[PDB]
Design an enzyme around this catalytic site. Sequence first.
Site, short mmCIF file in Angstrom:
data_model
loop_
_atom_site.label_atom_id
_atom_site.label_comp_id
_atom_site.label_asym_id
_atom_site.label_seq_id
_atom_site.Cartn_x
_atom_site.Cartn_y
_atom_site.Cartn_z
N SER B 21 0.83 -1.21 0.00
CA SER B 21 0.00 0.00 0.00
C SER B 21 0.87 1.26 0.00
O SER B 21 0.47 2.29 -0.55
CB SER B 21 -0.98 0.03 1.19
OG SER B 21 -0.34 0.47 2.37
N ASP B 297 -2.38 7.06 8.71
CA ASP B 297 -2.59 6.43 10.00
C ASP B 297 -1.21 6.06 10.53
O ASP B 297 -0.20 6.35 9.88
CB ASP B 297 -3.53 5.22 9.90
CG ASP B 297 -3.10 4.22 8.84
OD1 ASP B 297 -2.00 3.65 8.97
OD2 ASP B 297 -3.88 4.00 7.90
N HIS B 300 1.18 4.08 7.97
CA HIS B 300 1.28 4.48 6.56
C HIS B 300 1.66 5.95 6.37
O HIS B 300 0.90 6.85 6.75
CB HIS B 300 -0.04 4.19 5.85
CG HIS B 300 -0.43 2.75 5.86
ND1 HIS B 300 -1.25 2.20 6.82
CD2 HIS B 300 -0.11 1.74 5.02
CE1 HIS B 300 -1.42 0.91 6.58
NE2 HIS B 300 -0.74 0.61 5.49
#
Lengths: 342, 348
Positions: B21, B297, B300
Amino acid sequence: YNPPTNVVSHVNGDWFLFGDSRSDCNHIGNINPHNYSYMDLNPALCDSGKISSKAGNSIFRSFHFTDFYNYTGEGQQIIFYEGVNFTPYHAFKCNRSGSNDIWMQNKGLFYTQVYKNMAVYRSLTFVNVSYVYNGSAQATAFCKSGSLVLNNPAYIAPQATKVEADFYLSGCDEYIVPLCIFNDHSQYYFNKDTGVIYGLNSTETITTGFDLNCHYLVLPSGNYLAISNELLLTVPTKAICFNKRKDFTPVQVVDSRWNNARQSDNMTAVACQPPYCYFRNSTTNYVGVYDINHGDAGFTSILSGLLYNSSCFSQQGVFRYDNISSVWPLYPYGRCPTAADI
Amino acid sequence: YNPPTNVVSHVNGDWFLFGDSRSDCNHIGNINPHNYSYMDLNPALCDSGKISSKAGNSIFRSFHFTDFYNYTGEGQQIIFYEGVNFTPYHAFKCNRSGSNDIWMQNKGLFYTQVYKNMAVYRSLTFVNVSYVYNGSAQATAFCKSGSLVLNNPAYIAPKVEADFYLSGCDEYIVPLCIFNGKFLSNTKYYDHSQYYFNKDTGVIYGLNSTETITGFDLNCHYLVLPSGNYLAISNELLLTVPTKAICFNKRKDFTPVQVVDSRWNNARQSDNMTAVACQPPYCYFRNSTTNYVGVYDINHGDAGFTSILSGLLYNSSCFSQQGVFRYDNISSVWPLYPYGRCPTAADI
Ligand SMILES: *[C@@H]1O[C@H](CO)[C@@H](O[C@@H]2O[C@H](CO)[C@@H](O[C@@H]3O[C@H](CO[C@H]4O[C@H](CO[C@H]5O[C@H](CO)[C@@H](O)[C@H](O)[C@@H]5O)[C@@H](O)[C@H](O)[C@@H]4O)[C@@H](O)[C@H](O[C@H]4O[C@H](CO)[C@@H](O)[C@H](O)[C@@H]4O)[C@@H]3O)[C@H](O)[C@H]2NC(C)=O)[C@H](O)[C@H]1NC(C)=O
Ligand SMILES: *[C@@H]1O[C@H](CO)[C@@H](O[C@@H]2O[C@H](CO)[C@@H](O[C@@H]3O[C@H](CO[C@H]4O[C@H](CO)[C@@H](O)[C@H](O[C@H]5O[C@H](CO)[C@@H](O)[C@H](O)[C@@H]5O)[C@@H]4O)[C@@H](O)[C@H](O)[C@@H]3O)[C@H](O)[C@H]2NC(C)=O)[C@H](O)[C@H]1NC(C)=O
Ligand SMILES: *[C@@H]1O[C@H](CO)[C@@H](O[C@@H]2O[C@H](CO)[C@@H](O[C@@H]3O[C@H](CO)[C@@H](O)[C@H](O[C@H]4O[C@H](CO)[C@@H](O)[C@H](O)[C@@H]4O)[C@@H]3O)[C@H](O)[C@H]2NC(C)=O)[C@H](O)[C@H]1NC(C)=O
Ligand SMILES: *[C@@H]1O[C@H](CO)[C@@H](O[C@@H]2O[C@H](CO)[C@@H](O[C@@H]3O[C@H](CO)[C@@H](O)[C@H](O)[C@@H]3O)[C@H](O)[C@H]2NC(C)=O)[C@H](O)[C@H]1NC(C)=O
Ligand SMILES: *[C@@H]1O[C@H](CO)[C@@H](O[C@@H]2O[C@H](CO)[C@@H](O)[C@H](O)[C@H]2NC(C)=O)[C@H](O)[C@H]1NC(C)=O
Ligand SMILES: *[C@@H]1O[C@H](CO)[C@@H](O[C@@H]2O[C@H](CO)[C@@H](O)[C@H](O)[C@H]2NC(C)=O)[C@H](O)[C@H]1NC(C)=O
Ligand SMILES: *[C@@H]1O[C@H](CO)[C@@H](O[C@@H]2O[C@H](CO)[C@@H](O)[C@H](O)[C@H]2NC(C)=O)[C@H](O)[C@H]1NC(C)=O
Ligand SMILES: *[C@@H]1O[C@H](CO)[C@@H](O[C@@H]2O[C@H](CO)[C@@H](O)[C@H](O)[C@H]2NC(C)=O)[C@H](O)[C@H]1NC(C)=O
Ligand SMILES: *[C@@H]1O[C@H](CO)[C@@H](O[C@@H]2O[C@H](CO)[C@@H](O)[C@H](O)[C@H]2NC(C)=O)[C@H](O)[C@H]1NC(C)=O
Ligand SMILES: *[C@@H]1O[C@H](CO)[C@@H](O[C@@H]2O[C@H](CO)[C@@H](O)[C@H](O)[C@H]2NC(C)=O)[C@H](O)[C@H]1NC(C)=O
Ligand SMILES: *[C@@H]1O[C@H](CO)[C@@H](O)[C@H](O)[C@H]1NC(C)=O
Ligand SMILES: *[C@@H]1O[C@H](CO)[C@@H](O)[C@H](O)[C@H]1NC(C)=O
Ligand SMILES: *[C@@H]1O[C@H](CO)[C@@H](O)[C@H](O)[C@H]1NC(C)=O
Ligand SMILES: *[C@@H]1O[C@H](CO)[C@@H](O)[C@H](O)[C@H]1NC(C)=O
Ligand SMILES: *[C@@H]1O[C@H](CO)[C@@H](O)[C@H](O)[C@H]1NC(C)=O
Ligand SMILES: *[C@@H]1O[C@H](CO)[C@@H](O)[C@H](O)[C@H]1NC(C)=O
Ligand SMILES: *[C@@H]1O[C@H](CO)[C@@H](O)[C@H](O)[C@H]1NC(C)=O
Ligand SMILES: *[C@@H]1O[C@H](CO)[C@@H](O)[C@H](O)[C@H]1NC(C)=O
Ligand SMILES: *[C@@H]1O[C@H](CO)[C@@H](O)[C@H](O)[C@H]1NC(C)=O
Ligand SMILES: *[C@@H]1O[C@H](CO)[C@@H](O)[C@H](O)[C@H]1NC(C)=O
């Protein structure tokens, strides 16, 4: 002007050479007249304590046959100048129906494992593998050509419908052992400690004879078991013994070939690849002074780099100085020059 | 001044990145708010054509599990920024009395093969491995935890054997695994045992079980094999067979890969298995000196790792253990295990 030079050398004193008569200082006693012109090695290095060499021999030849020399040496930078003493010239095969190509393939596979591993270990020696078999049928010597007699792996026939033998690898961090078959019986080596199983089933091929195909396993210490389905069983009697892990250090391998009259091979060149190996070769026929096959200017020049320390080792050659040059070193080791404009 | 810098970069345009991600330019579509702050990668690279990445996934996760992403890419220099999506945080194990330690062992061995081989191949992808089993039993899935269901190797249970085929690649990574310890059957103890057999070369790769110091779970070895016609053979009641393989193509001159440490915020437990897998001469390991503190968050969009990846925004001359030297002329340190055009630390 700091060009890449066609020599084997060393960054410091911590180096070791493995070779044959062309760097065997002890051979001089066996020949008449007694002088050092048979060597490509410079005689000043005789007392160096950094050479393990034997006339008429090679590491591969010692590995497989009764004509055994216990090659032994330790160093950060390992150098090899041997291999010629098992070549197509010798025309080795097990029977009349055998194949020398199978054996050239074996040579290439063996030296690949030697070079890869000598870039990560300081020390190489041989050990005799202890093996036990209760089917006491002896070994036959089922593979001979002239004075070359195969003794690793050993053959065991059944005497007092499936045959096995125990063997033990001990004293070294890692070992090379041969696992072989004639190209309908299977052959397994089994590590009882780890549970790993290495095996070879027999299968035919179109362009060869009928000879012993070997694979060279790089194995850990342990209690092993050789197993076979049919009558014959092969078991290791000798192993290359690796010790003392080191920071990755590419080895140096000098082309070991005959004068062009005899038939040589390129299997050490095949085995010698980047990043673990640098291959050096002369641009000329081997024409020796002592006899046609011993004491050549081209190969004497290559070995002359052992007489001094050099900064940088690369695929193109050796750079003496670590500052500047007009060619970018490929796959370097040591302190290497730039070829940028400054 | 030309110091060894702590980034991943490339000599020229010929590079590719495998990630998660944190370099997944799609995914912005599946979140709210739609902001690229979750990435450590710079958004400018999103149209480079050189990123294969998927949120929540990793190469090892796709290799072994039903949660599959078809990682696919080609380049002279390869960079990996993934791994965190299979960690002790996930706490995977097969059965009740399983062991995550075993699966970290597995992780370390898989990535060792991945990095070693992407040093010598341009192109990496996945192939499905098709197998033929002539008995009645199906490939059942008995080994799972959470949303992670093992599907490679397959698990057949009625001497039993199955064909399998490796096509489409120069070389392949397939799993050969067994359960540790001896299983019981009518008083007598027996060993778990699996062979793979190349019918062409005649080579036989096998594993049998042994006693080792509780924690009974699936031990995998990752074989790097050629194309051919294979046989999976069991001496036990259960049969295992490969359903996927890592597909290598296009042999290239030796080019060390670059691996970026892939961990969580320290609140979650990570592992160092990719570090163990990444060694000289075939790999350089880059890691930040701080805890991962993300902005989207906690896990990340970190400064330390955004910095490391920023080196992809430009070409760099020389790659080494210590870091990336941008310029090829002069420096203050001698580069260790260098790749590219490297500077000297000598006095001119
Ligand atoms: C996930 O998605 C990806 C992308 O959609 C899928 O990836 C594809 O997988 C398939 C296999 O399923 C691959 O097909 C194989 O490709 C091999 C390589 O082909 C390329 O290279 C060949 C050789 O290149 C070398 O020489 C040239 C000089 O000509 C140099 O430039 C180069 O540097 C090399 O030195 C070329 O010849 C070829 O044109 C390609 O460029 C093939 O080797 C392989 O052939 C096998 O099968 C053939 C039958 O079609 C048969 O002829 C052969 O015998 C051989 O066994 C096969 O074509 C794709 O390459 C691959 N693409 C990418 C981008 O990765 C993936 O399948 C998918 N996965 C899943 C699970 O869904
Ligand atoms: C290490 O270095 C040496 C030297 O560079 C390499 O030697 C060459 O080896 C290759 C592969 O075996 C040989 O290739 C053969 O060539 C045959 C014909 O070659 C003729 O043309 C050459 C001139 O262009 C000429 O040098 C050669 O004669 C040489 O050998 C004669 C032996 O009888 C000798 O009388 C001469 O003095 C001269 O040295 C031939 O006239 C061809 O028929 C074969 O099929 C094959 O292709 C080269 O000929 C070798 N060259 C030399 C000079 O020896 C060696 O391969 C390198 N080692 C490795 C491992 O790579
Ligand atoms: C990537 O970089 C980061 C930062 O550079 C690095 O993070 C560090 O990870 C290690 C291991 O998780 C942490 O180490 C701990 O440090 C504390 C003190 O702060 C120690 O008390 C801990 O000691 C353990 O080990 C002891 C061994 O004797 C045991 O006795 C004891 O029981 C403890 O278990 C522990 O080592 C460290 O705090 C972080 N640091 C930061 C800034 O995050 C990470 O490890 C790097 N990744 C890799 C793969 O190298
Ligand atoms: C499961 O049953 C099938 C029967 O359908 C068995 O199929 C056999 O598969 C083998 C291996 O592919 C075939 O041999 C091959 O033949 C071709 C051409 O003749 C050759 O190119 C290959 O090198 C190979 O020798 C065999 O013909 C085929 N048998 C039949 C009847 O079609 C399969 O073996 C069974 N699998 C297991 C694990 O029992
Ligand atoms: C190359 O460098 C090495 C240092 O590694 C030198 O080795 C020393 O040589 C002297 C002899 O003059 C000995 O007294 C030392 O004990 C040696 N040390 C080691 C580790 O071998 C060597 O002399 C240098 N070679 C040249 C030609 O200068
Ligand atoms: C390992 O095996 C070799 C080969 O049998 C042994 O070499 C022989 O050793 C004896 C005693 O030193 C010599 O008389 C022979 O000349 C040797 N033969 C050869 C061909 O060199 C060696 O002794 C054994 N080593 C160990 C440690 O067991
Ligand atoms: C080859 O020679 C080396 C070097 O001497 C031998 O190494 C010895 O191995 C024994 C175990 O058999 C050790 O106890 C010794 O300490 C080792 N070195 C020395 C100097 O004693 C090695 O055994 C030999 N290999 C063969 C096959 O003979
Ligand atoms: C060492 O002895 C050998 C004798 O074998 C000498 O080799 C001679 O080499 C020269 C080269 O020009 C020839 O003239 C002779 O015909 C060679 N003889 C043989 C038998 O090959 C060599 O010159 C001697 N070198 C030294 C330093 O003593
Ligand atoms: C390899 O196998 C996987 C099985 O997971 C295939 O991926 C699935 O394909 C189906 C049919 O197109 C899709 O509906 C699923 O969404 C896919 N699953 C996942 C997890 O992505 C894949 O198509 C196969 N590849 C080939 C070339 O046969
Ligand atoms: C690179 O290093 C070499 C090795 O020392 C230098 O060689 C010296 O150059 C000076 C020039 O003033 C000569 O006088 C010496 O004879 C050389 N010494 C040796 C030991 O070879 C060379 O100058 C250096 N080049 C650069 C550009 O810095
Ligand atoms: C092969 O050699 C062995 C001894 O080395 C011998 O016993 C055997 O007869 C030979 N094979 C054939 C077909 O003659
Ligand atoms: C051979 O017999 C001995 C006991 O005499 C045993 O310890 C050894 O393991 C046996 N070897 C094999 C291969 O069975
Ligand atoms: C391997 O060779 C053995 C002969 O020892 C044979 O029994 C077996 O059928 C061969 N392998 C397979 C998979 O059939
Ligand atoms: C070795 O010789 C073979 C002869 O066919 C040749 O094809 C191959 O390119 C050679 N390899 C090297 C490294 O010289
Ligand atoms: C090396 O040259 C380049 C110019 O292209 C530039 O990085 C700099 O001038 C030189 N490096 C250093 C450290 O001075
Ligand atoms: C995205 O998030 C970052 C970090 O909070 C913030 O600074 C930036 O303003 C955001 N961008 C947009 C378009 O909302
Ligand atoms: C492992 O778990 C399955 C269910 O997932 C269970 O039925 C089985 O009994 C377990 N294995 C053994 C050997 O008991
Ligand atoms: C491994 O275990 C099986 C029984 O599960 C046994 O029959 C077989 O012989 C063993 N494999 C080897 C190579 O000894
Ligand atoms: C990984 O972690 C273990 C401790 O759990 C440590 O012994 C090992 O050396 C570590 N390896 C690396 C490369 O950090
Ligand atoms: C790197 O070099 C290539 C040409 O090889 C060039 O097209 C590309 O723009 C360069 N990359 C960067 C980030 O400047």
